[PDB]
Structure 1
Amino acid sequence: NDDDNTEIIKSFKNFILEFRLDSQFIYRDQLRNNILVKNYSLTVNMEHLIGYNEDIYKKLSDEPSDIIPLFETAITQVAKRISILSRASLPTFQLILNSNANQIPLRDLDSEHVSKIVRLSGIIISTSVLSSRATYLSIMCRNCRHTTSITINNFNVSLPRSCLSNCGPDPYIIIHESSKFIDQQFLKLQ
């Protein structure tokens, strides 16, 4: 499985590093320009992703909840390669998508669209406070203090049920000092 994930990641790394229009490497430039002002994200136009290699867009649109994290991982690797000297740290970059696909009006979205990429429009009626979600949990066993960590991607997660080698019935707790968190906000669209 992770061999295929490695190949997906390499394909996205090549998309960032190779995609070019009219002599400009727009995604290398955008990634660098974002890094300088210290926003760790990349805005990708899916027209360009389709134009580069439509197999990649097929993988992404088939199952975005597994493929978006791999694309974000690819962006981190290129970010380091174009902003940190190789052999003389950054968070996991957010992937932002621009699209011109046909919109689905809010009332038409239903069971056939579950897990698909969807484009729509509306009016935001509410905005909640910034809740905190984990990107990376430092973890240890309450009894034997076996220590491990869980990387988390927010596309649909839990702690393990029992210790990874007696430790009791439900043994793991979080270590908040070495865990990492991100802002999460809820919006209501009408």
Structure 2
Amino acid sequence: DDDNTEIIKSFKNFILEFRLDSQFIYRDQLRNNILVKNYSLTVNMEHLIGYNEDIYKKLSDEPSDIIPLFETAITQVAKRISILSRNSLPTFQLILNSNANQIPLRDLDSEHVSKIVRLSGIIISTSVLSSRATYLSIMCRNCRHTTSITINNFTVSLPRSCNCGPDPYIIIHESSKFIDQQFLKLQEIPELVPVGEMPRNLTMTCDRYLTNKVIPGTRVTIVGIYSIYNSKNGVAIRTPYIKILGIQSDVETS
């Protein structure tokens, strides 16, 4: 994966060299974020597209295969800032909020699936937190293979190879690093465009530092990727959800 090296080098070069005249907005965004122990970063796409058109050309192409190489790309930077040597430092979440063009809820039909979509709606109720996993160790029921699986985002079955089989892998919960998740569910705004019909509600998964960021009932504008999950209820009929990166409430709202 020299290509991922090529992409991550461009992301480092985007964080370290970026200049708004003359402070480095991101690089200081980083420091001032690790000190308060926020462990997050908010990219402003306009600066991004200003810097290179290219990396935004790919980031609006296949977001879910790229964005995590951006996460690892930035946490590899906080290693050189927040500490120095010659731990532990979670891979930061990035929250990107940008103008673009508002795409109303009714107008989401396929065709933009896995392409970043900014939109606007009133949140109905927030689902109770539950943890997904980030880094979990796994041992085999027989050969006892000790495997540290780095699970990324954005479901993923466990590897069967070190009889043995079919799936002899146990989750060690004593060493496993966990994050959080939310599930907002948002009803589009009553002004537009209900017409004569009840307004649809797309299910959204916030995670890590955006979680509990928003009280249910407050208007917001979400950004996030658009994507689909299975959830047996045929055929095939997969149902739609919006991953959120990252959320920004309306003015102010505090």
Shift of 1:137: 1.6
Q: What CA distance in whole angstroms lies between the structure 2 residues aligned with 1:18 and 1:181?
A: 32
1:180 — aligned with what? 177
* TM value normalised by structure 1: 0.95
2:158, 2:167 within 8 Å by CA — same for their partners in 1? no
Shift of 1:160: 1.1
1:162, 1:169 within 8 Å by CA — same for their partners in 2? no
Give 5+ residue unaligned stretches, structure 2: 188-254
Q: What CA distance in whole angstroms lies between the structure 2 residues aligned with 1:168 and 1:10?
A: 40
1:137, 1:180 within 8 Å by CA — same for their partners in 2? yes
Q: What CA distance in whole angstroms lies between the structure 1 residues aligned with 2:144 and 2:114?
A: 38
Q: Which runs of 4+ in 1 moved over 6 A?
A: none
Alpha-carbon RMSD across the aligned residues, in angstroms, is: 1.4
Q: What CA distance in whole angstroms lies between the structure 1 residues aligned with 2:7 and 2:23?
A: 24
2:125 — aligned with what? 126
Q: What CA distance in whole angstroms lies between the structure 1 residues aligned with 2:31 and 2:139?
A: 37
Q: 1:142 to 1:88 in 2, by over 3 A?
A: closer
Q: What CA distance in whole angstroms lies between the structure 1 residues aligned with 2:60 and 2:86?
A: 37
Q: 1:88 to 1:169 in 2, by over 3 A?
A: closer
Residue 28 of structure 1 aligns to a residue whose secondary structure is helix
Matched-pair identity in %: 99
Deviation per residue, 1:54-105 (Å, 9 max, x gap): 1011111111101110111111011111111131921010010011100110
Instruction: Tell me how many residue pairs correspond in the alignment.
Output: 187
Give 5+ residue unaligned stretches, structure 1: none
Q: 1:88 to 1:146 in 2, by over 3 A?
A: closer
Residue 120 of structure 2 aligns to a residue whose secondary structure is coil
Residue 179 of structure 2 aligns to a residue whose secondary structure is strand
- Whichever structure has more helix as a proportion of its residues is 1
Q: What CA distance in whole angstroms lies between the structure 2 residues aligned with 1:5 and 1:178?
A: 28
Residue 68 of structure 1 aligns to a residue whose secondary structure is helix
